[PDB]
Amino acid sequence: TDRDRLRPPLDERSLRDQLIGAGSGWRQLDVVAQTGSTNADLLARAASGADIDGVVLIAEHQTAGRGRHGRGWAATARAQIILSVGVRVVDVPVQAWGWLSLAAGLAVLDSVAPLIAVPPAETGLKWPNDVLARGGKLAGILAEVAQPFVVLGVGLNVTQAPEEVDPDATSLLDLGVAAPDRNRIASRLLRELEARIIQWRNANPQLAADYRARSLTIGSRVRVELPGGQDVVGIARDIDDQGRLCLDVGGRTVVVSAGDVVHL
Ligand SMILES: Nc1ncnc2c1ncn2[C@@H]1O[C@H](CNS(=O)(=O)NC(=O)CCCC[C@@H]2SC[C@@H]3NC(=O)N[C@@H]32)[C@@H](O)[C@H]1F
């Protein structure tokens, strides 16, 4: 109830002013009061012929949010930055598309990391789509294909209470950021995202280096839950050129393209 006072609406006109124009790759930005899923919405635009490259859709509230492989994403009004962007990908070899999602996580982390007074333990990226802080999930990322595009979706907990959405969640507010400004954070996020997408498109080695530098997974003992329910336990060693997680399982290398990681 008290957090409602900490949740003013986004300023669409201001965001457009900052993010659309010379020197920016963003072509269109809309803030909607509510939708089922920003990712579904941009996918639908693309399916009906729209050019969604550089298009940004932000929702104040999202009622049927999607997580990875069939799961959901929970939100309440004005508690998160909930957005999707369109990225033309057909010019880039399909092998490299995995890195687009890792790039997005890096952009989200970099957009908020300074806001914390002192970095609590376990602040960084958990493979393949998670921004963690103090062991809690601060943001989740979802990439979906609609040729010639990928739709990249970000759900970032700004004032969202864990009790409102998930026991393993956290938020900037719950990390001690007393009055987070979503307008400032959204602008920072989209500027970081633009740079990382450009790096991805040009196979810039700094993208992988920067990802490794913020990885909480690399070097850690992990249990990885694979699609289909199997678990593999090992030590995460690296990410390969396809964005896949390279596991050491007692001297054998197991490369995982998709799965859920638990740090042990
Ligand atoms: N708030 C929330 N904060 C933190 N955690 C949470 C939370 N709402 C649930 N869990 C938990 O996360 C689980 C899903 N996690 S996941 O499989 O790794 N998927 C993701 O993290 C990707 C989420 C992408 C969300 C964005 S929001 C804008 C865009 N449009 C969409 O519909 N999706 C993307 C879910 O089953 C629930 F367990």
Ligand 1: does its nearest atom lie under 6 Å from the Cβ of 84? yes
- Establish whether residue 129 lines the binding site of ligand 1, counting it when its CB lies within 6 angstroms of any ligand atom: yes
d(CA 137, CA 159): 13
Cα–Cα nearest to 153, from 261, 241, 33, 72: 72
For domain 1-217, give the CATH superfamily.
Bira Bifunctional Protein; Domain 2 (3.30.930.10)
Closest C-alpha among 209, 96, 189, 187 to residue 139? 189
216: closest CA among 144, 120, 147, 146? 120
Say which experimental method was used: X-ray
For the Cβ of 67 lying below 6 angstroms from any atom of ligand 1, the answer is yes
Q: Is the CB of 187 under 6 A from ligand 1?
A: no
**Distant-in-sequence, close-in-space partners of 159: CB < 8 Å, separation ≥ 6:** 3, 6, 7, 78, 79, 171, 172, 173, 180
Distance (Å, whole) CA 151 – CA 88: 9
CA distance 174 to 29: 29
DSSP alpha helix (H) spans, the chain = 12-19, 38-47, 98-112, 162-165, 182-201, 205-213
Query: What is the per-residue DSSP string for 96-164?
Result: GTHHHHHHHHHHHHHHHGGGSSS--SS-EEETTTEEEETTEEEEEEEEEEETTEEEEEEEEESS--HHH
In short, whether 66's Cβ falls inside 6 Å of ligand 1 is yes
230 CA to middle of ligand 1, Å?
21
Q: Which residues of 153-176 are buried (b: 16+ CB within 10 A; e: fewer)?
A: bbbbbbbbeeeebbeebbbbbbbe
- Asked if 86 contacts 149 with a C-beta cutoff of 8 angstroms, the reply is yes
Q: In the block, which residue shows the tokens 């003992």?
A: 221
State how far the Cα of 242 lies from the Cα of 110, in Å rounded to an integer: 22
* Pick among 2.40.50.100, 2.120.10.60, 3.40.50.720, 2.30.30.100: CATH of 218-264: 2.30.30.100
Domain boundaries, given as residue ranges, for the chain: 1-217, 218-264
Q: Which two tokens stand for residue 90?
A: 């057909």
Contact 263, 225 (CB under 8 A): no
Q: How far apart are the first and last CA of the chain?
A: 35
* CB-based burial label for 15 (10 Å; 0-12, 13-18, 19+): buried
- 135: phi > 0 → left, psi -120 to 50 → alpha, else beta; which? left
Q: Mutate which of 35, 37, 62, 73 to test ligand 1's pocket (most atoms within 8 Å of Cβ)?
A: 73
Give residue 23 CA to ligand 1 midpoint distance, Å: 32
What is the C-alpha to C-alpha distance for residues 14 and 73, in angstroms, rounded to an integer?
27
Instruction: Decide: 207 in ligand 1 pocket, CB within 6 A.
Output: no
Residue 44 CA to residue 22 CA, distance in Å, equals 28
Q: What are phi and psi of 211, to 5 degrees?
A: -65, -50
Q: For ligand 1, what atom is nearest to the CA of residue 75?
A: 1
- State whether the beta carbon of 143 lies less than 6 angstroms from ligand 1: no
